[PDB]
Design a protein around this ligand. Structure first.
Ligand SMILES: [K+]
Ligand SMILES: [K+]
Ligand SMILES: [Mg+2]
Ligand SMILES: [Mg+2]
Ligand SMILES: [Mg+2]
Ligand SMILES: [Mg+2]
Ligand SMILES: [Mg+2]
Ligand SMILES: [Mg+2]
Ligand SMILES: [Mg+2]
Ligand SMILES: [Mg+2]
Ligand SMILES: [Mg+2]
Ligand SMILES: [Mg+2]
Ligand SMILES: [Mg+2]
Ligand SMILES: [Mg+2]
Ligand SMILES: [Mg+2]
Ligand SMILES: [Mg+2]
Ligand SMILES: [Mg+2]
Ligand SMILES: [Mg+2]
Ligand SMILES: [Mg+2]
Ligand SMILES: [Mg+2]
Ligand SMILES: [Mg+2]
Ligand SMILES: [Mg+2]
Ligand SMILES: [Mg+2]
Ligand SMILES: [Mg+2]
Ligand SMILES: [Mg+2]
Ligand SMILES: [Mg+2]
Ligand SMILES: [Mg+2]
Ligand SMILES: [Mg+2]
Ligand SMILES: [Mg+2]
Ligand SMILES: [Mg+2]
Ligand SMILES: [Mg+2]
Ligand SMILES: [Mg+2]
Ligand SMILES: [Mg+2]
Ligand SMILES: [Mg+2]
Ligand SMILES: [Mg+2]
Ligand SMILES: [Mg+2]
Ligand SMILES: [Mg+2]
Ligand SMILES: [Mg+2]
Ligand SMILES: [Mg+2]
Ligand SMILES: [Mg+2]
Ligand SMILES: [Mg+2]
Ligand SMILES: [Mg+2]
Ligand SMILES: [Mg+2]
Ligand SMILES: [Mg+2]
Lengths: 213, 117, 169, 77, 112, 83, 109
RNA sequence: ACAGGUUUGGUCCUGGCCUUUCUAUUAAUUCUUAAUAAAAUUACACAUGCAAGUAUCCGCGCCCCGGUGAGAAUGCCCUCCAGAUCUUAAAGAUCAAAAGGAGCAGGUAUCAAGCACACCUAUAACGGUAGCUCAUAACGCCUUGCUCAACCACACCCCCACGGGAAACAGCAGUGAUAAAAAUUAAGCCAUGAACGAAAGUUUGACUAAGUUAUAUUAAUUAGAGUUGGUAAAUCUCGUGCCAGCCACCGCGGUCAUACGAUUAACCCAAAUUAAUAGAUCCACGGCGUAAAGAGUGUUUAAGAAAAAAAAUCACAAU
């Protein structure tokens, strides 16, 4: 839509450039963004208070970079586990780090972004994914002599059914249509529960988006 | 109205006067008001029993599976409503509420009889 | 209508009783005719009578007149794909041209009746809402159901005022 | 409803959340029901998705569409 | 095969008004519009710009216009397609013979 | 009321039959074959019934939700008596 | 008026009404400025009890007091309607009895 | 409109104003109860409380709902639609920016000319042409939310908001000022809707169920208001004496008033009645010798008619 009296507003575009310029120049650093007071459980930067379900793990554990700084090359090729998987999953779950770049703002070097290779329930992916939920105070590091103990895995086949009956009313319509069209076979319809595999909710999602394929 | 985002959703829209509710099963953008503009009206759901003791429900089955096929989200009550009809399996929260009713009723029966004796 | 030679042709019924619907590919109709000679009687009467009917049924089709440019009256149709349809009228009467036009480019009777049949399903009888778009406005307008409390007051046991009183007591 | 730029309240500025209790036996069964229920609905959602593809494909390049296209073209000539 | 246009008029026929500008002819399109009160049709004149590459436009012609797939400016959205009736030089489309109004310039019944 | 009791005359238009074809063959009105889970009496889905979780899973949940735990309950009653 | 002329001029549309002495508002509140007596035009002769007030919009206009007898004094608050008195030219407002500082007519006692 | 009252000593004609019908707000007089719908002075300044959280930290959401009609002739319908989001087998769908136009779109021409408003080449420069909109209303000015499952716009002001003035309830309730305009500083997330979580679930002044008010409709438990010369249903006895006063239009009162004020009686509506202001509706498909109306005359441009027939004039005082 348009009219013959359109006025060329310029301040709106001017504000957009300056606002975009300011945020790029004043982008908060990871050290100051995630710094936390361990008594009030309050975030000085965002002003957010952590939920009570996460209070215990903060004071009784360390994040990824706290256990990764004291390594020669920031632990490239090392295996890193997480307390969340250890408590709920008997099968071993770990990350094989590929590269890691911490931020120099922190005086103790306790922050940064890291990548790695995912191993969930003994299933290994063939691509590198950026590590999600790094700042969480639940990570742990496995020893060198225990590396092969956790790496060893026993493959257990899945016993879930591959087909389930249709819901009752929807089952009737399937029978009704084929009977109407002449298909009088009395074979019970089934649903292929094979393309509907659901990853567990604790599985980390891809931080990077997906481009056109 | 032009919204930033939102997902297509099938939900219940309230109607009728006070003390006489009446829900219309409608499919509209999630960011629009409850009684606001909608894409297509599917059915109806009368919450009060009539003289025959029936709560009437209407569903546009061929259209309902069309919107679900194109990626429409369902709210809590419509899933329970569809589950009763048999189009969908019984919602897990529908069963658990049933089980809670039995246990509360079982406690109620025992509590009344314990006081009796 | 009082003014004009034939006031009947300026009423809504006359504009609506002409049944000539062009296909979706017809865009421009050019009509050339003469103001003199007995041969142009069919062309002149077609312009004076049928053209208002044709345009009313085809609001998006341009109709342009040209007088005394060609000795032989004719009609020219321009399609969407650049196709040109030339219709020659030199002795055909008013009625003949309309029948001739209806067959070369008009729509079939089965196509028109099925088009409006699919239009009926838009206003589905099973829906509720405003009177302008739906038949009923509420479920209380259906016999047997609980009526609107405005007409018939509801029993006290169902009113929320009584429900809240006992819960607090 | 509030906006992004208005300040929050003062009284409710200390609390964050208070999750309810968890029944161990009931929670596990409820979680198991959801895992199968979501799986079943997803298969139906994909089945309906394939139905829409079939309907749209037939409306575009179905056999009846070619008959209709040829019939009008033949009549026009 | 995406060569559509966003305008509501794909093909229009109008009379040439003037050819003052360079390789562009301003034409006047005429359409019938129903007056709501009198229920009678009157002509409504609108001006269109058409791009003429060969400079073939003379004032007084009747020209068919074809919608341009991409506008060349804020006003030129149509391209000339053919000269339906050259001014003063009108050939009857039926008999393919030169004519001047009602009288035939050349007799169609005289091949030789 | 009088017109409803026939005491007074009023116009009655002639009305065509509701349906075009009178067929009871379709499965919407005719009885459909019972489901294999219907004749057996088993619930339509395995998870509709109540199943006792393994004790290992119960211990894991108790550790995870320790402190805010609630009293657990057994299988629900099959039939609810009347007060 | 032939067909073409009727088409060009369009259908006749009734002009909107002109605002009255009360500027379209049903009732206005004013402050009494002066009380005087106005006389009608023949063949009706009398002494009509009028008053001059300034309305809430700031304009100053002449008003009329219906009924017999009044106790209105300068700098009193009254309410004015939009009626008109036929006998008195110019006067186009009437004080509504029974509001603010003017009461109803007093029965003879 | 089924029309009625009113020009004149009197008739006909032409032509205004007003009565009779329905809806809303305020005010006067009056008032018993219940239910439902609705709640409306003010884009003026605002005390206090509340209106966005959820969640094993990340993240997501945070005028979305809601509020208002200030602004703009804005617009309606319609073509195309990037981009954002959801679903997934990466091609389907929801919302749709910008841009565009078959047509439709308030008043005013005592606003008649606007003053760069066009186009070509190649470049995305330079160079070249001298054009574009407009009496079918350009360019101006004034008034204004709307064509309603809804849409367009604003979010203290400087059309915008880097900045500046300056320190924000046009979120619910409430207050000051102002206006003829007068709802509770209340309860709950039980339902539905929205946000977040895998999930039990949490928040939610949106909403649900209530509080308040003859503003409307219904039922019943409830009785007062207006009018009584004519149009227009209906009265007598006194007082007053062109005085006090009455009227929607015509009019009444100048010591024998069915018109003022009171009384008796009657009429008409009824928990309402009457008055006031807006709105619905209402002018010409009718007229131009005498009534408002054929412009002092002729030709031509825009534009429109032609359709059957037929038509270059002429002693005399044109210039
Ligand atoms: K009259
Ligand atoms: K709730
Ligand atoms: Mg947060
Ligand atoms: Mg309601
Ligand atoms: Mg009066
Ligand atoms: Mg008078
Ligand atoms: Mg008072
Ligand atoms: Mg008062
Ligand atoms: Mg006279
Ligand atoms: Mg007289
Ligand atoms: Mg009041
Ligand atoms: Mg009430
Ligand atoms: Mg989580
Ligand atoms: Mg709104
Ligand atoms: Mg206002
Ligand atoms: Mg305004
Ligand atoms: Mg303006
Ligand atoms: Mg758009
Ligand atoms: Mg797109
Ligand atoms: Mg897409
Ligand atoms: Mg002037
Ligand atoms: Mg602003
Ligand atoms: Mg605010
Ligand atoms: Mg408020
Ligand atoms: Mg404010
Ligand atoms: Mg106040
Ligand atoms: Mg009010
Ligand atoms: Mg008060
Ligand atoms: Mg109080
Ligand atoms: Mg509360
Ligand atoms: Mg609670
Ligand atoms: Mg809830
Ligand atoms: Mg969710
Ligand atoms: Mg209420
Ligand atoms: Mg009285
Ligand atoms: Mg009186
Ligand atoms: Mg006397
Ligand atoms: Mg009278
Ligand atoms: Mg009297
Ligand atoms: Mg005259
Ligand atoms: Mg005259
Ligand atoms: Mg003249
Ligand atoms: Mg003249
Ligand atoms: Mg001409």
């Amino acid at each position: 839509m348009a009219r013959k009296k359109v006025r060329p507003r310029l301040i709106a575009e001017l504000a957009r450039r300056v606002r975009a310029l300011r945020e790029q120049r004043e982008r908060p650093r990871d050290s100051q963004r995630y710094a936390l007071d361990y008594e009030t459980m309050m975030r000085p930067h965002s002003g957010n208070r952590l939920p009570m379900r996460a209070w215990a793990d903060v004071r009784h554990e360390s994040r990824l970079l706290q256990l990764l700084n004291r390594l020669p090359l920031f632990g490239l090729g090392r295996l890193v586990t997480r307390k969340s998987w250890l408590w709920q999953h008997d099968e071993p779950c770990y990350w094989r780090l590929t590269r890691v770049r911490p931020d120099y703002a922190a005086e103790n070097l306790d922050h940064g972004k890291a990548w790695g290779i995912l191993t969930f329930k003994g299933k290994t992916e063939s691509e590198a994914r950026e590590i999600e939920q790094v700042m969480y105070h639940d990570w742990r590091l496995v020893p060198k002599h225990e590396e092969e103990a956790f790496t060893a895995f026993t493959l257990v086949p899945e016993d879930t059914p591959l087909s389930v009956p249709y819901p009752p009313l929807l089952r009737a319509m399937i029978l009704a249509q084929r009977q109407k069209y002449g298909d009088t076979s009395t074979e019970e319809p089934m649903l292929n529960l094979e393309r509907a595999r659901i990853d567990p909710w604790d599985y980390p999602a891809k931080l990077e988006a997906k481009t056109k394929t | 109205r032009a919204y930033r985002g939102g997902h297509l959703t099938i939900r219940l829209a309230l109607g009728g006067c006070t003390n006489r509710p009446f829900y219309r099963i409608v499919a509209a953008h999630s960011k629009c008001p409850r009684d606001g503009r909608f894409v297509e009206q599917l059915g109806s759901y009368d919450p009060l029993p009539n003289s025959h003791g029936e709560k009437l429900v209407a569903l546009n089955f061929d259209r309902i599976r069309h919107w679900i096929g194109c990626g429409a989200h369902l709210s809590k009550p419509v899933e329970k409503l569809l589950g009763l009809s048999g189009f969908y399996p019984l919602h897990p929260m529908m069963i658990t509420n049933a089980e809670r009713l039995r246990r509360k009723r079982a406690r109620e029966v025992l509590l009344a009889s314990q006081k009796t004796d | 209508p009082m003014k004009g030679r034939f006031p009947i042709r300026r009423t809504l019924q006359y504009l609506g009783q002409g049944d000539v619907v062009f296909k979706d590919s017809v865009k421009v109709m050019t009509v050339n005719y003469n103001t003199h000679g007995e041969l142009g009687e069919g062309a002149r009467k077609f312009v004076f009578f049928n053209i208002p009917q044709i345009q009313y049924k085809n609001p998006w089709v341009q109709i342009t007149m040209f007088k005394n440019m060609t000795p032989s009256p004719f009609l020219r149709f321009y399609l969407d794909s650049g196709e040109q349809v030339l219709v020659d009228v030199e002795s055909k009467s008013n009625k003949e041209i309309v029948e001739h036009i209806r067959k070369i480019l008009g729509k079939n009777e089965e196509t028109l009746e099925k088009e409006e049949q699919e239009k009926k399903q838009l206003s589905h009888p099973a829906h509720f809402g405003p009177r302008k778009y739906c038949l009923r406005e509420c479920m209380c307008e259906v016999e047997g159901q609980v009526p609107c409390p405005g007409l018939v007051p509801l029993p006290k046991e169902m009113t929320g005022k009584y429900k809240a009183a006992l819960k607090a007591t | 409803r509030k906006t992004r730029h208005d300040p929050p309240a003062k009284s409710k500025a200390g609390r964050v959340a208070t999750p309810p209790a968890v029944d161990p036996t009931e929670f596990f069964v409820l979680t198991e029901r959801y895992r199968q229920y979501r799986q079943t609905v997803r298969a139906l959602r994909l089945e309906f998705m394939s139905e829409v593809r079939k309907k749209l494909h037939e409306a575009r390049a179905g056999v009846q569409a070619e008959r209709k296209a040829q019939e009008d073209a033949a009549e026009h000539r | 095969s995406i060569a559509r246009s966003s305008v509501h008029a794909k093909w229009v026929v109008g009379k040439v008004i003037g050819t003052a500008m360079q390789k562009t002819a301003k034409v006047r399109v005429t359409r019938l519009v129903l007056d709501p009160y009198l229920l009678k049709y009157f002509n409504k004149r609108k001006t269109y710009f058409a791009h003429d590459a060969l400079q073939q436009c003379t004032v007084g012609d009747i020209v068919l216009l074809k919608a341009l797939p991409v506008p060349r400016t804020k006003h030129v959205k149509h391209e000339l397609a053919e000269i339906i009736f050259k001014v003063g030089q009108v050939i009857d489309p039926v008999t393919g013979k030169p004519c001047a109004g009602t009288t035939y310039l050349e007799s169609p019944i005289s091949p030789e | 009321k009088a017109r409803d009791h026939g005491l007074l005359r009023y116009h009655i238009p002639q009305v065509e039959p509701r349906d075009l074809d009178f067929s009871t063959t379709h499965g919407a009105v005719s009885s459909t074959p019972p489901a294999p889970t219907l004749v057996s009496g088993d619930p339509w889905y395995p998870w509709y019934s109540w199943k006792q979780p393994p004790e290992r899973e119960l211990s894991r949940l108790r550790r995870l939700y320790q402190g805010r735990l609630r009293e657990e309950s057994g299988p629900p009653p099959e039939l609810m008596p009347e007060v | 008026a032939t067909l073409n002329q009727m088409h060009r001029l369009g259908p006749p549309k009734h002009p909107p009404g002109k605002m009255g002495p009360t500027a379209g508002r049903p009732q206005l509140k004013g402050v009494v400025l002066r009380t005087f007596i106005r006389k009608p035009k023949k063949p009706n002769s009398a002494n009509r009890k009028c008053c001059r007030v300034r309305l809430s919009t700031g304009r100053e206009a002449v008003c009329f007091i219906p009924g017999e007898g009044h106790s209105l004094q300068e700098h009193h608050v009254v309410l004015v309607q939009g009626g008109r008195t036929q006998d008195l030219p110019g006067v186009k407002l009437t004080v509504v009895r029974g509001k603010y500082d003017c009461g109803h007519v007093q029965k003879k006692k």
